[PDB]
Structures are given as C-alpha cells and as structure tokens.
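pipeline: protein-struct stage 2 | run 1193 | Spore cortex-lytic enzyme pre-pro-form
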Amino acid sequence: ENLYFQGHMQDGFLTVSIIDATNNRPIQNAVVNIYSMSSSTLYQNLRSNESGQVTGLVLPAPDVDYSLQPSDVRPYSQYIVEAIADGYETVVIEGTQLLATIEARQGVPMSPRRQSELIFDIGEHTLYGTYPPKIPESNLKPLPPPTGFVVLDNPVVPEFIVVHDGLPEDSSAPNYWIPFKEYIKNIASSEIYSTWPEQTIYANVIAIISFTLNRVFTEWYRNKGYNFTITSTTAYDHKFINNRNLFEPINVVVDAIFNTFIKRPPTSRQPLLAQYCDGQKSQCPDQMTQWGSKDLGDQGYDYESILRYFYGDEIVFERAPIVSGVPVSFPGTTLQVGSSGQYVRTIQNQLNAISNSYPAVPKVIEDGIYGTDTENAVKIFQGIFGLPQSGVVDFKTWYEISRVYVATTRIA
C-alpha cells in the first residue's frame, strides 16, 4: 500500500558505449544483450552503431520517489550488460544501476584477443548498501615549502588519477589510471543519486573534487611510499567501482565544474579535504551530510550556500589550472559561429582527428573560422559524449574535446 502497488516500475534510460580498450576507438556492430537481476532476457542482439553506441534503451526502474528520501527499498534497478564482438574478449557488466526518469550511461571497454570473459561487478550504491565508515582524518595536511612557481605551489587538476582498488596496505590490489573527469563522475555516481536537485549535485561534486585534489596536491599516498594517488575504499577515501555506469545529470555537472574546489581558510594553498556522509546510517558534524544537502536542494538553495552551510561562510571557491595533455587552455570566452582565430583552428584540428575514430563527426576545413560546418561537428560530438548539443564550444565542451582527442590519438 505505498503510493501505488508494491512492485511498481517506471522508465529509466540507458546508453551503452563500446570502445576498444587499446586505442579508445568505438567498436561498431558489437552485440549487446541486457538481462535482469533469478535473471532473464530483456534485450537481445542489439547492434552498436558507428560511434560504438546503442542509445535510448528503456528499462524499468523503481518509483523515483524511493531515491528522494532515505528508504528501505533499493531505489534503482540492476541489470546485466553483455558485449560480444569478433576479435574481442567478451565483457559482462553485472549490476548496472538504473534510476527512473534519468539516463544511465554504461561504458564497455573490450580488449582484443578464447572462452575467457571479463566480468565487472557493480556493488551497491553507498546510499543504500552498507560500507565501512570513513576513518576520521584532518581537513588540512602539511605541505612542502613553496618553490615560488605559483602554479607548482598550488593545486592543478592532473590528467589522470591512479586508483588503488583496495586498502592502502594490501599490495596485491590493482592500480588503475583513470582520467580525472571520469574519476569524479564514478565517485559521484556512487555517492549521490542523480535524480537529486541540480544545485545539490553541484555542491556534492565540488566536495568530491576538493577531497580528490587534496589527495593529489598533498601527494598523500606517494609521500607515504605507496605508488598510487587514492584508494577505492570508503574507509580512507570514497567508493570507486571500476567500469560502473555514470549518469547523465552528473556528467554534465562535472564537465562544467571539474576544476572548482573549496578553500578554508580562504588563505589556504591546499583545497579543503571535504568530507561527507549520508546522514541516516551515519552522522558527521562540521561536515556535509548527503541527505542534508538534498533538503537544502529541495528548499531552493544554490550550491555555494549549500557548502557554506555545512563547511562555513568564509570558504572560497577556486578554479585550478587543468593539465589536459593538449598544451592550449580554454581562453575564457565561448567560441561559436562568428568566432575566428587560433583557438577555432585548434578545435577544428582536434575534431578532425577525433573523426578518424568517430566517423559520425563530419570533417571540417581547418581554416580557423567557426562556421556552420564546425557548429554541426560540435553538435554531433556533444551528442555522442552526453553533452547538451548547443553546437557551441564553452568550457565544458572544450575540455571534453581535448579529452577525446587525446584518448584517441594516444597509441593509434
């Protein structure tokens, strides 16, 4: 006797992206099967398109209401996604998590080669499952003295994070090189539900970035003699799940503010080691509660006041330099039809390169004039990587282009 009948299901959406793990190139015409979780078929023999994608799948998901309050019911569905493709070792993803009204994006990296298969398993979301609580720890850490290079004396967004999938002291756990923005998206997809108010996603993603960039900037684990940047566990850091699916509302937020962080006191060099907790299973004062920032989201607060409410009035928001592996930075003005010059020529040069791996991206004359041709290439590109198809190269589209350009021009 809930709102409806117990068992009621809504539509949540899915897009599957199949990429060759050795060169990041999309795989076309792979088979994609979907199953449920007891387990039975739902979709059979889906074929990936020329961008390696099968888009717009529709899958049942619990009532969205279960993800807007603390609940005993799992607020998301779990599915199995199977990718098969000739020449490639098959990949099964178990536990792909679907939220009603929202697009889940599942990435499938396949390696080239007989009867072996890769199984990635996605555990329970931290807001639902039970995970070891976060070992308490100080918010500010010691630093080496300033070398006087200012960019070196202050946080910069690295290009990669080296994640240790296990406790720090378990030397047998694997280390993965994750691109920064895919890292933050993976943490956020397990820490919050993307059916949450926009301003609440922003404020939680900035806490995640402050934390993560404090591990990077203080070189926490290297100066303790480990060969990694952060671990995947909830006790020392936050829950990272290799190849879990990301969510569209979270991806667009991160694309937009992935270099923004908290400083407290405002004179800090290092970003605040911003810590949180859900706020039902566990309390944590002087810090942020995930469920508590949802309330303030519901009550219409913006993100600077959500964070200032949990961490204090005096905090300031900083934007860190970004190493993207293209030695040009976004110039601070959106490029669009009409624009001209070297930044436009650089966009067109990157998109043409990308289009050798993603032929859906039509080619453009590389002349430095942002014409209809370029706006159409940017709209198709945006559409492939889950971005609003404004056809406009603002900050978030700039670094997404650089990210794919590098990912596909790296080994081949």
